[PDB]
Amino acid sequence: DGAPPIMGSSVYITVELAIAVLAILGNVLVCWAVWLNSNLQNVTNYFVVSLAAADIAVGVLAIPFAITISTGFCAACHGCLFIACFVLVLTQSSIFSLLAIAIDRYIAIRIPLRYNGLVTGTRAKGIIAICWVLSFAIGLTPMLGWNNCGQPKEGKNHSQGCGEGQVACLFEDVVPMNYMVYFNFFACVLVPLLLMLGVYLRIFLAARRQLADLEDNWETLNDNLKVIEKADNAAQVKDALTKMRAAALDAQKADFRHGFDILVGQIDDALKLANEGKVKEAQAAAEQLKTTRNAYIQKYLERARSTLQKEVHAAKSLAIIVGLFALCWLPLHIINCFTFFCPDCSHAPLWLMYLAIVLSHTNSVVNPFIYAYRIREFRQTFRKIIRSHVL
Ligand SMILES: Nc1nc(NCCc2ccc(O)cc2)nc2nc(-c3ccco3)nn12
């Protein structure tokens, strides 16, 4: 006869309430910043709002649900199922939101040309609504028959003094583990994570490929120029210039038409000269190109470089969220795995179970800090609010 469980429950409940406090405050701040700042009103941040909404729900409902379910109190089976699986609904919502963010940034970085023509607030709202609905379908799947209401714990039901029909409300007693591992973890959680990793890999790959392409064009431009200065034949000049022309109109694909028009025009003129056997005429005419480069091309390619740097930094910041999501949630899934795939093992200790539950809950508090740390716009919007209504 050992330590009173309420002593541990005091800690657990206090920790849970603190986590709820932070989860509500941080995410409320996020939503407020997005609502009043017009720079933060794009399709990409609407998913941020949805994620923050799920986190608010965690702080308002899932945590109280966790505190209640932990009691093992007497309630009808299906009611206990809802209480236990509402967090699954929210977690699936978060999954779909993160995956939507990844796909949005992918579409933005590979085809920004037709990004707006494809991605709008209308279709985004339709997506988010469909995502919430499918999250409900997934999370509450157990209530559609895939439960253990038909296999109750006679000993427990009669120990805790429950009514006819009712059952004690614990997780592993009503929520089947094959569902948690196969259906929820392997299919509806792990696979999405693999997909997110793939998409972000493709994002960074495309950013690197574009920077190398523009760099090859820039180097082709200047190297052909140097070749002109060193060449000693009209045909050698025209060869280098034709290839410089190709590189010029290639880098063009990356107000600004003025610069590239001047460059390509100068290249056409140098070509016409070289074709008419006019060598040094071409070498001198192609020497003014560098000015056109020092006034337009360099100024455009540095700006394209900074734009890709910004999108890369944004992709990194948005991927860190998925990282923390995985790190906070996977421990419970691993615990479920070895609660399902090892009958010869000893079950994980109760303190470790609640520790992992608390950990999974902490994910609803990190996102705002990530935003304020990484994203200048979010940071300074939070700053204004913090120095607008309350200090
Ligand atoms: N395995 C598990 N257990 C619990 N709570 C109850 C643990 C327990 C274990 C033994 C016992 O006699 C009474 C209760 N909550 C849990 N939540 C989750 C979870 C949430 C999201 C993914 O897995 N897994 N999970």
Curated annotation (Swiss-Prot):
The protein, known as: Adenosine receptor A2a
Family of this protein: Belongs to the G-protein coupled receptor 1 family.
Residues carrying a glycan: 157
One BP term from GO: negative regulation of vascular permeability
Signal peptide limits: none
Free-text note regarding domains: The cytoplasmic C-terminal domain is necessary for targeting the non-ubiquitinated form of this protein to the cell surface.
Covered range of the whole protein: 2 to 308 of 412
Residue intervals on the Cytoplasmic side: 36-45, 104-123, 202-317
Species: Homo sapiens
Entry's Gene Ontology cellular component terms: asymmetric synapse; axolemma; dendrite; glutamatergic synapse; intermediate filament; membrane; neuronal cell body; plasma membrane
Gene from which the chain derives: ADORA2A
